[PDB]
Amino acid sequence: MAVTEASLLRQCPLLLPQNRSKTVYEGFISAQGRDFHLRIVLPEDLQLKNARLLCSWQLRTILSGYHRIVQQRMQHSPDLMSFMMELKMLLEVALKNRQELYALPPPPQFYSSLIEEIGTLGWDKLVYADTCFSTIKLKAEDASGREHLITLKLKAKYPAESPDYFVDFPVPFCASWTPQSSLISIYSQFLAAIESLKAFWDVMDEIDEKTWVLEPEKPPRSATARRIALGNNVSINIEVDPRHPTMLPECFFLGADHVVKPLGIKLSRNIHLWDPENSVLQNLKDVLEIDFPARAILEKSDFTMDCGICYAYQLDGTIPDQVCDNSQCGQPFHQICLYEWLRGLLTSRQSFNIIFGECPYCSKPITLKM
Amino acid sequence: VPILDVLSSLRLDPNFLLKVRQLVMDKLSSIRLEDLPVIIKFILHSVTAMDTLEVISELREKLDLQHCVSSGQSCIILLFDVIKSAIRYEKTISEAWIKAIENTASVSEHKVFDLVMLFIIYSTNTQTKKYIDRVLRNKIRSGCIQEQLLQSTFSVHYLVLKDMCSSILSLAQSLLHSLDQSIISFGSLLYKYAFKFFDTYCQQEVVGALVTHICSG
Amino acid sequence: IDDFIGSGTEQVLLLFKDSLNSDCLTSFKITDLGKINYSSENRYLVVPPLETGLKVCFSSFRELRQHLLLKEK
Amino acid sequence: TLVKILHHLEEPVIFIGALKTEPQPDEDVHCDCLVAFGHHGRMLAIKASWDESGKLVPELREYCLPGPVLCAACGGGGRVYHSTPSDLCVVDLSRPEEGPGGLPPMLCPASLNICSVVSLSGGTKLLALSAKGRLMTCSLDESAGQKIKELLSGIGNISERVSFLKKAVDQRNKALTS
Ligand SMILES: [Zn+2]
Ligand SMILES: [Zn+2]
């Protein structure tokens, strides 16, 4: 109400007077459905510039951080009404920040139905459950038989709300959550999301097995961009559409200005021969008109594929890609080391985003595009 | 936007389109960020040989670009692109636009937009370059254009300009060859910010242009 | 009965029928009745979740007893 | 020739100790956190946060872990070993501090008067007394058909008392407006 013989009830129904004079109030205060003990003793007059105020030790621990704000507001407040309103707003923000302290499940809703839904899914999809029963992980199989796991976080009462779902594959997973949706509902949704990008995996596992795959080393299911070795110290990279995987992915080469040169020239005049019905590897072998070194040496150091500046492979994951346009050197280099070297050099002239200069080993013209 | 596509699709009289155009121009600060560009796209499709001046005036009056705050960047960019395409694939937009900021003479309350569009137009079709120089000298001597302007201009919208830095220098070149210290100071600030925010090649071109000024000038 | 294993908890020992041999300690059987059964996986995945849940809502129960007594006073 | 209460827990006290939480050899390591214990399972953790004010701030916690706690002690690496009347259980803390006070057991009976020692050899080895009066030393590093029975036994234990506490809520909302 406007008057505090009714507004005091409407806003702190739990907070009520003991003393004849309405000077000793006691009771509780509600906050997120939690009734906290409170005793509050005003002066003879209804001035808050003095207002004795003790609590629970619970409450004083929770208000460690704001007792100065209490000292401020007790003295600055016009009325006990607005004082307590602001107090409850404060309590809510306090627990909102300290929201890590909050969970308790109802068993017969939760611990009953959840194992029925597990038997619904299959106990063999069951890969893990948490000692809290907070987390649970499950398995889905691509029709090839690739395992795609997924994690799920369960509230106190699960089907009331969405569980927090965490999945490996790259596209934003959408789970249409109704309370009628159960574990198998979201499992079918998981499968439908898997079956959309199924034929992508059918090319990806092929590429994983066949060729000298380079730099999504141990590629997860998220990986839509790949890198392949070919020839020697010339590597290609690919990025594929999960929706049209056999469609031509966008690609380019890394390597030499005499090895990468006729590779693209063949590609330009055979891309029209791209038959998307075949496998991607098979299409490439004819489009590029070559065989791969199909793991032909894979990960065995003959000192060929090495920076020559830093003398390393996978410098910050960076590959020896920049090479010499020379038959005699063919010394491959990183980006960063070659950049920093041709930085200080006097002859190193800079165009838009190019650095020219001499190869460190052979002193022949070498071009770096950033 | 759907409404607009549909109105492009249906059999209509144009007098109604005009009403709607005015209507959106009122309802033009009162739009969310994202669609904005396509609305403007519509407008600039919708415009004609004659109405152009007035609509632009209203537009030039209603666009702010201090108001639009990943909080405005992508969309602004896309906007500029759109405009860029518009004034690429027709000419008279630019002459009208210039006219509009040129005859905005009494206005000592000039907004950011104007310079940005000037750069752009300088970068694009070039017959008018001498027109642009002329007008820019004239507003500078008038003192309607000043330097905290350029400050906030390069403090925000630079990203637009990176890919036309060469325009800035080709201009500053013609700025320092003139008299009237304020003009020369403007060109200075140009060279300064250009070296400041942009990349190595820019910096290099800065130094290389200043040296030329020194030795020859 | 004892922790003959030395794993911490008690187990049971059983002896069968000296008809076997004129010798003790043969035909034994040790067990816990849990996983432990000595003689002469989806099921084993979900127990800790349950055993948490019981004590969890037990703590809830005690908290709300305290709550009860409080407003009574 | 003064004394100062700090928090006042509300159940009988059993254990007090300290930890080097975030322990990231030397005998005396600078303890970061503080721990205090009750009898009916009320635990207290204290930390210094110096956050949210640009000044030094205390960060507190009051946990309520189950069982009438019999005894406990601190393990190196920010751990605590404590004996319920059912089993011995542990709580690790080092992460600022944990929101929930989870705990596993270690498959050992209801001990009392635990006393921990550090090896730094490998791992943690300790000492204890069984409630039956037996001393022991520790070194540290069908069924689903029974499981469903266990699930539903626990559900049946809990739902009764949830309803009971709702009956309290009704009493209380009613007496309030009285
Ligand atoms: Zn390197
Ligand atoms: Zn070379």
mmCIF file with all atom_site columns, N, CA and C in Angstrom, chain B residues 164-186:
data_model
loop_
_atom_site.group_PDB
_atom_site.id
_atom_site.type_symbol
_atom_site.label_atom_id
_atom_site.label_alt_id
_atom_site.label_comp_id
_atom_site.label_asym_id
_atom_site.label_entity_id
_atom_site.label_seq_id
_atom_site.pdbx_PDB_ins_code
_atom_site.Cartn_x
_atom_site.Cartn_y
_atom_site.Cartn_z
_atom_site.occupancy
_atom_site.B_iso_or_equiv
_atom_site.pdbx_formal_charge
_atom_site.auth_seq_id
_atom_site.auth_comp_id
_atom_site.auth_asym_id
_atom_site.auth_atom_id
_atom_site.pdbx_PDB_model_num
ATOM 1  N N  . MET B 1 164 ? 41.875 2.875  -48.992 1.00 0.00 ? 164 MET B N  1
ATOM 2  C CA . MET B 1 164 ? 41.948 3.994  -49.947 1.00 0.00 ? 164 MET B CA 1
ATOM 3  C C  . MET B 1 164 ? 42.946 5.035  -49.454 1.00 0.00 ? 164 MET B C  1
ATOM 4  N N  . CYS B 1 165 ? 43.888 4.605  -48.604 1.00 0.00 ? 165 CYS B N  1
ATOM 5  C CA . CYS B 1 165 ? 44.948 5.474  -48.066 1.00 0.00 ? 165 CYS B CA 1
ATOM 6  C C  . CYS B 1 165 ? 45.620 6.270  -49.189 1.00 0.00 ? 165 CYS B C  1
ATOM 7  N N  . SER B 1 166 ? 45.881 5.636  -50.325 1.00 0.00 ? 166 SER B N  1
ATOM 8  C CA . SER B 1 166 ? 46.528 6.318  -51.458 1.00 0.00 ? 166 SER B CA 1
ATOM 9  C C  . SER B 1 166 ? 45.786 7.597  -51.862 1.00 0.00 ? 166 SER B C  1
ATOM 10 N N  . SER B 1 167 ? 44.463 7.625  -51.716 1.00 0.00 ? 167 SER B N  1
ATOM 11 C CA . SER B 1 167 ? 43.651 8.829  -51.975 1.00 0.00 ? 167 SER B CA 1
ATOM 12 C C  . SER B 1 167 ? 44.047 9.977  -51.068 1.00 0.00 ? 167 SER B C  1
ATOM 13 N N  . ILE B 1 168 ? 44.213 9.674  -49.804 1.00 0.00 ? 168 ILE B N  1
ATOM 14 C CA . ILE B 1 168 ? 44.533 10.683 -48.793 1.00 0.00 ? 168 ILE B CA 1
ATOM 15 C C  . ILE B 1 168 ? 45.821 11.399 -49.176 1.00 0.00 ? 168 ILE B C  1
ATOM 16 N N  . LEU B 1 169 ? 46.803 10.647 -49.638 1.00 0.00 ? 169 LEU B N  1
ATOM 17 C CA . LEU B 1 169 ? 48.115 11.236 -49.910 1.00 0.00 ? 169 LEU B CA 1
ATOM 18 C C  . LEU B 1 169 ? 48.040 12.070 -51.171 1.00 0.00 ? 169 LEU B C  1
ATOM 19 N N  . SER B 1 170 ? 47.437 11.520 -52.247 1.00 0.00 ? 170 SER B N  1
ATOM 20 C CA . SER B 1 170 ? 47.254 12.238 -53.531 1.00 0.00 ? 170 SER B CA 1
ATOM 21 C C  . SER B 1 170 ? 46.551 13.576 -53.274 1.00 0.00 ? 170 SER B C  1
ATOM 22 N N  . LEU B 1 171 ? 45.750 13.649 -52.208 1.00 0.00 ? 171 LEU B N  1
ATOM 23 C CA . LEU B 1 171 ? 45.067 14.886 -51.800 1.00 0.00 ? 171 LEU B CA 1
ATOM 24 C C  . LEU B 1 171 ? 46.043 15.779 -51.043 1.00 0.00 ? 171 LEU B C  1
ATOM 25 N N  . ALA B 1 172 ? 46.625 15.242 -49.962 1.00 0.00 ? 172 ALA B N  1
ATOM 26 C CA . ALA B 1 172 ? 47.530 16.011 -49.097 1.00 0.00 ? 172 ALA B CA 1
ATOM 27 C C  . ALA B 1 172 ? 48.610 16.655 -49.949 1.00 0.00 ? 172 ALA B C  1
ATOM 28 N N  . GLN B 1 173 ? 49.051 15.963 -50.998 1.00 0.00 ? 173 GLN B N  1
ATOM 29 C CA . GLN B 1 173 ? 50.005 16.515 -51.975 1.00 0.00 ? 173 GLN B CA 1
ATOM 30 C C  . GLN B 1 173 ? 49.501 17.856 -52.498 1.00 0.00 ? 173 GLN B C  1
ATOM 31 N N  . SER B 1 174 ? 48.259 17.908 -52.973 1.00 0.00 ? 174 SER B N  1
ATOM 32 C CA . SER B 1 174 ? 47.664 19.149 -53.512 1.00 0.00 ? 174 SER B CA 1
ATOM 33 C C  . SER B 1 174 ? 47.336 20.137 -52.392 1.00 0.00 ? 174 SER B C  1
ATOM 34 N N  . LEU B 1 175 ? 47.169 19.681 -51.139 1.00 0.00 ? 175 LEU B N  1
ATOM 35 C CA . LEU B 1 175 ? 46.958 20.586 -49.982 1.00 0.00 ? 175 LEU B CA 1
ATOM 36 C C  . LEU B 1 175 ? 48.210 21.396 -49.631 1.00 0.00 ? 175 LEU B C  1
ATOM 37 N N  . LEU B 1 176 ? 49.391 20.775 -49.535 1.00 0.00 ? 176 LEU B N  1
ATOM 38 C CA . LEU B 1 176 ? 50.597 21.487 -49.045 1.00 0.00 ? 176 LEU B CA 1
ATOM 39 C C  . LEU B 1 176 ? 51.160 22.418 -50.112 1.00 0.00 ? 176 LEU B C  1
ATOM 40 N N  . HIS B 1 177 ? 50.892 22.189 -51.408 1.00 0.00 ? 177 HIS B N  1
ATOM 41 C CA . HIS B 1 177 ? 51.343 23.089 -52.502 1.00 0.00 ? 177 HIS B CA 1
ATOM 42 C C  . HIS B 1 177 ? 50.629 24.441 -52.511 1.00 0.00 ? 177 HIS B C  1
ATOM 43 N N  . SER B 1 178 ? 49.590 24.614 -51.693 1.00 0.00 ? 178 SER B N  1
ATOM 44 C CA . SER B 1 178 ? 48.830 25.872 -51.619 1.00 0.00 ? 178 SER B CA 1
ATOM 45 C C  . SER B 1 178 ? 49.365 26.737 -50.475 1.00 0.00 ? 178 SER B C  1
ATOM 46 N N  . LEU B 1 179 ? 48.785 27.927 -50.364 1.00 0.00 ? 179 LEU B N  1
ATOM 47 C CA . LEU B 1 179 ? 49.149 28.952 -49.370 1.00 0.00 ? 179 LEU B CA 1
ATOM 48 C C  . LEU B 1 179 ? 48.252 28.767 -48.138 1.00 0.00 ? 179 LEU B C  1
ATOM 49 N N  . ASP B 1 180 ? 48.062 29.780 -47.294 1.00 0.00 ? 180 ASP B N  1
ATOM 50 C CA . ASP B 1 180 ? 46.993 29.760 -46.281 1.00 0.00 ? 180 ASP B CA 1
ATOM 51 C C  . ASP B 1 180 ? 47.249 28.620 -45.301 1.00 0.00 ? 180 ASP B C  1
ATOM 52 N N  . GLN B 1 181 ? 48.162 28.904 -44.388 1.00 0.00 ? 181 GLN B N  1
ATOM 53 C CA . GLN B 1 181 ? 48.668 28.012 -43.328 1.00 0.00 ? 181 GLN B CA 1
ATOM 54 C C  . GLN B 1 181 ? 47.674 26.943 -42.845 1.00 0.00 ? 181 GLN B C  1
ATOM 55 N N  . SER B 1 182 ? 46.399 27.280 -42.628 1.00 0.00 ? 182 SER B N  1
ATOM 56 C CA . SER B 1 182 ? 45.419 26.304 -42.100 1.00 0.00 ? 182 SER B CA 1
ATOM 57 C C  . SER B 1 182 ? 45.308 25.095 -43.033 1.00 0.00 ? 182 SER B C  1
ATOM 58 N N  . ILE B 1 183 ? 45.296 25.341 -44.349 1.00 0.00 ? 183 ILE B N  1
ATOM 59 C CA . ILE B 1 183 ? 45.267 24.288 -45.393 1.00 0.00 ? 183 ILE B CA 1
ATOM 60 C C  . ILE B 1 183 ? 46.483 23.395 -45.245 1.00 0.00 ? 183 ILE B C  1
ATOM 61 N N  . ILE B 1 184 ? 47.626 24.045 -45.120 1.00 0.00 ? 184 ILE B N  1
ATOM 62 C CA . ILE B 1 184 ? 48.923 23.356 -45.028 1.00 0.00 ? 184 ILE B CA 1
ATOM 63 C C  . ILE B 1 184 ? 48.903 22.509 -43.752 1.00 0.00 ? 184 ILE B C  1
ATOM 64 N N  . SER B 1 185 ? 48.375 23.054 -42.652 1.00 0.00 ? 185 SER B N  1
ATOM 65 C CA . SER B 1 185 ? 48.239 22.323 -41.376 1.00 0.00 ? 185 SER B CA 1
ATOM 66 C C  . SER B 1 185 ? 47.318 21.119 -41.549 1.00 0.00 ? 185 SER B C  1
ATOM 67 N N  . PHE B 1 186 ? 46.244 21.292 -42.295 1.00 0.00 ? 186 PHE B N  1
ATOM 68 C CA . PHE B 1 186 ? 45.333 20.176 -42.570 1.00 0.00 ? 186 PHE B CA 1
ATOM 69 C C  . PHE B 1 186 ? 46.149 19.062 -43.229 1.00 0.00 ? 186 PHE B C  1
#
